[PDB]
Symmetry: C2
Subunit: 425 residues, 2 copies
């Protein structure tokens, strides 16, 4: 009996072949981009389902259209599992992305021209928290706080002073390159002092929140946004949570009809699955291992003479300052790409280089942790990177790095049931 | 060897079971919602792929991140096939939805408070063309044109007069409940006369444009948006086209980083597949049959005493005025749902009922045309609906309708390779 994949090979061999090549690419490199992960077979199965065919504008049991009996059930399972996982009174699982989740919150709380305050984009703030190239900075007045030049982490007394001076309507916490625990109770105290709304955008750390390895913002903030991918290891999509169920209804209307049309019900089924996985003990152990792995990589890089911004990490990621090897982030990113390692350049706090150049490399553990790597495997990764960056013109080092990458990939197969290679025998 | 679907059954039997029930629901009702379709096995296979795991912010060969060799190739195939299919100098295949496609256009062309002019939402305009409950009406000044009370179709002289009076910055054409051909050349003349930008949002009719059964807006408008689902029969997502490649670059930046973060590369692979299908002769014949089927249903409803708004259809859809049966749209929608037919209520032009009630039912042919129904099968559909609506209290009519629906569903299987029933023998 024919599968959907059989149909794809028969009718579009070009796309079929390129998809096979992308699986092989995933298998044969070290994925160290801190926002990346490998979602489950079960999640992928939902995304490949007939749920793509249902229009389901509205909410479970309050749809514009009939025929949503089963979409409602699936969406309500997603909602209910999200509420369970994050201890939340309200969840909206329809946002197409983290950007769209944030946008729906802005549409609810703000009007164009209102002032928002988030982390400086060069200190780990997100594009959607006030970049001039994003709607958040183009149609709102974005101001910023950064980290302490001394500690390279947040100084809550300084944030309070900035907030008192700027008087934002919305304060945003949660970041894309911040390696330490965020104190949501201190953010609440600050927001209350200046009469601001408080959003925690926990996209990067949501799996750590879900597993109890990071404090949960939900009881403290007005609203919490996240992606369903990243550390939560779900399908690509967004999520809005809030402790306030009446406010939750307002966010609902801002998602639809405020921001979006019909939701992606196949992706929402994937969200339900991913939340279901995160409710299990295996995921809690996984999240523990993510942190341990990131800490092991950071420590070995320190042992190899690199500076880690803030001196280490409490989460899944780290920023490597590249002064010790006299390289820009851009150069370092290219050099590790050339040995089959994916990372990305990142400004360090108080970087003297442009954002186009940077002095940092951002690394994270989630993706390779999903493939089963342990702390000593991550110390090996640290050594491969240090070798490459310390000897960038040495071709024999380059090939040793290539070989050591290949050995790690061979030891930790990815999705081995899919397009399995021809047996050696 | 295990499949992803095997993993889903093993690890989440709740979601697995609900997905099976949704396939059965798709199989066992008549899908007459005009925006619905059944996308191909090949499309679904792409959406179920490992492409969900790649972050690919930027554009092909101009990404923020490494590792996009194969994502670039797939995205560029999607782009190239879209440019081919729609005769367009520029295509952006990243928008998560039609709403997000439109939003990116607004971000490019407009600022908050600017005036937009689109079709009245009660005469077939979309939420995203200036509804007060949508960002398009909340943060912009929306004005409207409608159809002629006499012809129930557009009167371009009247549109010109409204445009001259209102002086919009952007004129939008393309609708969600308009049954006649749109004259894009007349819209260009109008926009040029008042110095407005011109957007064609062809979401509902994009497959008919693609097949040559409707005129193409691309050479005439500044920009063209669409969904990839609906008559185009692709995955759920959006698309921006333009004749002006320099303007295309501006739209690119408005999608990312303007509006969105990372694209859904698995969905984009699906877009490539769907565009590839639409380039083939079978799809052109399909689109011909969509129109013929819609016309056959409209004609038989006329024969049964119903008024069709504008007197008929030139496309995939029609609006049935329900005065002949003394029912509201809401009542009619419920009555056909009760016999396993999905449609939706819709205001007619100059409706005396609220949008919550309406005097119309919107019907379309795409979904059941995909299942292989012909014109006489659609005349049967018309008769089932007429029977139900003319005799709403008659239980024997009700069951006859149920039975005749079941016979149609049995004659035209949907995805018969998936979860096939136990053989009768």
């Amino acid at each position: 009996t024919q599968t959907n994949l059989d149909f794809l090979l028969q009718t579009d061999p070009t796309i079929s072949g390129m998809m096979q090549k992308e699986l092989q690419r995933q298998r044969e490199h070290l994925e160290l981009i801190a926002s990346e992960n490998f979602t489950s077979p079960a999640v992928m199965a939902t995304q490949g389902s007939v749920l793509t065919n249902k229009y389901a504008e509205g909410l479970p049991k309050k749809r514009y259209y009939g025929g949503c009996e089963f979409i409602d059930e699936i969406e309500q399972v997603a909602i209910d599992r999200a509420k369970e996982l994050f201890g939340a009174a309200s969840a909206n699982v329809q946002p197409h992305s983290g950007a769209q989740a944030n946008f729906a919150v802005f549409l609810t709380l703000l009007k164009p021209g209102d002032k928002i305050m988030g982390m400086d984009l060069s200190h780990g703030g997100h594009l959607t928290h006030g970049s001039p190239a994003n709607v958040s900075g183009k149609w709102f007045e974005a101001v910023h706080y950064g980290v302490s030049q001394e500690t390279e982490q947040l100084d809550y007394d300084h944030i309070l002073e900035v907030a008192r001076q700027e008087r934002p309507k919305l304060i945003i916490c949660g970041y894309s390159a911040y390696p330490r625990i965020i104190n949501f109770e201190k953010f609440r105290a600050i927001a209350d002092e200046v009469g601001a709304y408080l959003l925690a955008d926990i996209a990067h750390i949501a799996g750590l929140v879900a597993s109890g390895h990071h404090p949960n913002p939900v009881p403290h903030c007005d609203v919490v946004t996240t992606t369903t991918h990243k550390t939560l290891r779900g399908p690509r999509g967004g999520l809005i949570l809030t402790r306030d169920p009446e406010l939750g209804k307002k966010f609902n209307k801002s998602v639809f009809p405020g921001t979006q049309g019909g939701p992606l019900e196949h992706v929402i089924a994937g969200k339900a699955v991913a939340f279901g996985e995160a409710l299990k003990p295996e995921f809690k152990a996984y999240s523990g291992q993510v942190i341990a792995n990131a800490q092991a990589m950071a420590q070995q890089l320190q042992n190899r003479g690199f500076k880690i911004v803030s001196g280490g990490t409490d989460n899944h990621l780290m920023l490597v300052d590249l002064r010790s090897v006299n390289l820009t982030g851009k150069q370092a990113d290219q050099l590790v790409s050339d040995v089959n390692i994916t990372a990305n350049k990142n400004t360090v706090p108080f970087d003297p280089e442009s954002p186009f150049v940077t002095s940092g490399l951002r690394l994270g553990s989630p993706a390779m942790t999903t493939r089963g790597l342990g702390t000593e495997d991550f110390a090996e990764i640290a050594n491969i990177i240090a070798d490459r960056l310390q000897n960038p013109e040495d071709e024999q080092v380059k090939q040793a790095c290539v070989q050591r990458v290949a050995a790690l990939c061979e030891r930790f197969p990815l999705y081995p049931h899919l397009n399995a290679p021809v047996p050696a025998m």
